[model samples]
Target: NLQTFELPTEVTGCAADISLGRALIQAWQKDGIFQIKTDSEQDRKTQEAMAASKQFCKEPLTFKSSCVSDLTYSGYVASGEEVTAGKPDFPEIFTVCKDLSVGDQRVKAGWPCHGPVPWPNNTYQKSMKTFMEELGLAGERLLKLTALGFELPINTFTDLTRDGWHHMRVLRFPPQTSTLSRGIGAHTDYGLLVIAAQDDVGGLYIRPPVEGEKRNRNWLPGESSAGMFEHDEPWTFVTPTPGVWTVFPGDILQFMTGGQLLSTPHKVKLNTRERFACAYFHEPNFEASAYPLFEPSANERIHYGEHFTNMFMRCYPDRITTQRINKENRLAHLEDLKKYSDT
Candidate 1:
């Protein structure tokens, strides 16, 4: 069973609570995921965002596609338009990223994941903005508590995440008519953390990573030695609770912690009823780069922008080509770092 942590009504006190901080870290190390009980205010914001998600998905196809953009992750993505592990996913998605002003260099130069979101309507936009802001603050508080667990200053992780390249996806998963239909394929997120709020028609499942086991690359039923849904599988169902948000560490966090914390692989399988959910990714700044904090002597560091661009390009292949993005230009920051090291 997945562990659930209760976030005190006053979040600021969480960082100084040594016992609670350690318990959270221990839970994450064991299951790689956990749930947080949201206060009334947080629950209300999540519900508002979820309502907006469902309303947006009910719009006409033409209206929904009006804001679709090939240049960035922000905007609308129709069902079947997004591919996961080479297969089309069955959820319609609307995403909003940290808004960069038109004058920002990344926005002006057409960075792949940087730019303003083309919000469908003011109500939807306001609801999402409010919820995302609250969610982001909660994520920061959690990070501070995590730092305390490591015996580091409370601000350690938060400092690295200032001006974070945060984004949130509001998703609508239609009923699954076939066993082969995928709500979303098994995969790990690319950023530092993810906080997701799902409706009670919960289909989320997680497979905790075993120590010293190689990562599984094949998710299809018959393609691999052990299929994802095999009778003896490790997948555990995540029971959804109202006013509780599921949280997990992502690849970057795993890397930063030197694998002390795992980035669990997860997937969703829709029930007969339609499902609506929102997931917020709390990531480090686009230009921020770091080696494993616990393994500072490691030779290679992860450059956030480079890593994110690579993963983004893979998931949205058609968008990259259609948008005429120069992949190399997107890595200019990485290249500059490399040049400095060489000199």
Candidate 2:
């Protein structure tokens, strides 16, 4: 019953027909689902899955005052598992990656870009769990679909996401004023798949690269404004249909597919109407290192949890600065240490 779903025709490297009831192993070998595409919205299961999320709309929500992480004024409601916070080698981990020039481009253009912050919800724990279970199941179907598309066993990615850093977020865009320019900036997702449910008041736009471009490029989240980053493509506004979901291919899938798949850059356009959307980011297990599923020779090794945390630190430098400079008086000393140390 859950196995039924659709992939867009523009999507290369996936099965042309899964319902054909036969494995297309040879056809499945490609980098991954890189191109930006959409699936048929006619499925009842897909509609019901999205409908489950609509019940969560409530108010007096946490509105972001200062900068945080990826998206602005976003709130985190749930996690797939009870993830422990902090790693002993946290600072060293980020330094080594930056020194290694990990992903071809500097992971952070400038430290601490304004964005998404986690809002843990004990209040909605039960409801959140129920929602995660459904989304998680839907996510599993997607994994199977991708795996079969890759000509691999449907369970190929099962171990990767188990006990992983799965995060679910709720986003609200109130009737925009002139002061609010962009709802969020253009950037690629850092994880596996980003399945989202958006309100009828649409604003989502993605810039997927045309075929034949080199896939091994940096996917840093750039500003929503023009000339921030060079792109060979134009932004395409994706309209939201009620009870339907939007899925974005993330960097991990691109890595798993080697250089065949691409991570698409997407952002939201600010508009009037209180727009609401929910996103679930599926990542690999903490210990799982990314490798090319098709290209064994590719240099693919990324620690899942560490990189996720590093991205947060890069985007939300104040999160680090705030922790470092706990209180005002002590902050000055640390500030002096940071300044003098830089000098």
Best by lDDT: 1
TM-score against truth, every candidate: 0.88, 0.60
What is the lDDT for 257 in model 1? 80
Estimate, for each residue in 60-175, the C-alpha lDDT of model 1 and write its tens digit: 99999887555566888888987666678899899898766678887777665677778899999899989988998888878888887887777778887899888988899999
Give all candidate RMSDs, comma-separated: 3.9, 12.6
Q: Candidate 2, after superposition: displacement of residue 77 in Å?
A: 11
Candidate 2 residues lying further than 4 Å off, grouped into runs, are 1-123, 212-216, 219-233, 320-343
Candidate 1: give the clashing pairs: none
Query: Taking the tens digit of each residue's C-alpha lDDT, what string does model 2 give over 1-343?
Result: 0111344323223445443212212221222122222334333433433343343333222432222223221332221111111211000000001111223221222222112233233333434445555556656666766676656776677678885556665555545666653555555667787776666778877765555544444433332222223333556666765444555567787667664455656666666765656667777764466677887666646656456645554544454433432332332332232343211
Say which candidate scores most in TM-score.
Answer: 1
lDDT of each: 0.76, 0.47
- Model 1, stretches more than 4 Å misplaced? 8-16, 109-112, 209-212, 216-232, 320-322, 327-343
